[PDB]
Amino acid sequence: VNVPKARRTFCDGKCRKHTNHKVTQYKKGKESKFAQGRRRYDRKQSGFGGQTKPIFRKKAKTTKKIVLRMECTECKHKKQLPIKRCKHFELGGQKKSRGQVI
Amino acid sequence: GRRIRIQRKGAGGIFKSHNKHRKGASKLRPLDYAERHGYIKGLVKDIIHDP
């Protein structure tokens, strides 16, 4: 899958019109240790009793829905669009050619 | 499982020493003035079998 690095698309921000967006790939942030879930989980785990929450062990997916973060070049408003599952992804790769020798 | 014979030996029951007829402990004399600054003479009264 090849996706260009620039896209003219609708902007939900102040623009409310079609504008240019710089496209990048979204990446999950670092998990904080002061999130309520982490605090609760740490307190629950501390002490005697062993593991207190399930541990997932049956992964079956081999891909992920790639999320494109597109930032408007006029207000810096950022959109997130998921695309379909793909094994290989590249941003702004070389475009396909037609009628060329191999 | 159950405790193994090795483990059962520490309680010191049927595994205690059979010492009814022992003739005593083998020990030199306590260190004292005679042995530290000279010598003391003793007479071998007996040679015996210690079970």
């Binding site: - | 499982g1 405790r3 193994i4 090795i6 483990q7």
Partner: protein, 42 residues
């Protein structure tokens, strides 16, 4: 016993056990640096 059982009389696991093994497990050749007949001087 750790060696007991089986349809054949066999240990089933290496008989050399580490020094810090638990009380009910420390049987056999404890902390053995080597095994087998001594060929030479030791």
């Amino acid at each position: 016993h750790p060696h007991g059982g089986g349809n054949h009389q066999h240990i089933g696991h290496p008989s050399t056990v580490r020094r810090d093994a638990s009380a009910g497990k420390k049987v056999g050749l404890i902390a053995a640096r080597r095994t087998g007949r001594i060929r030479g001087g030791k």
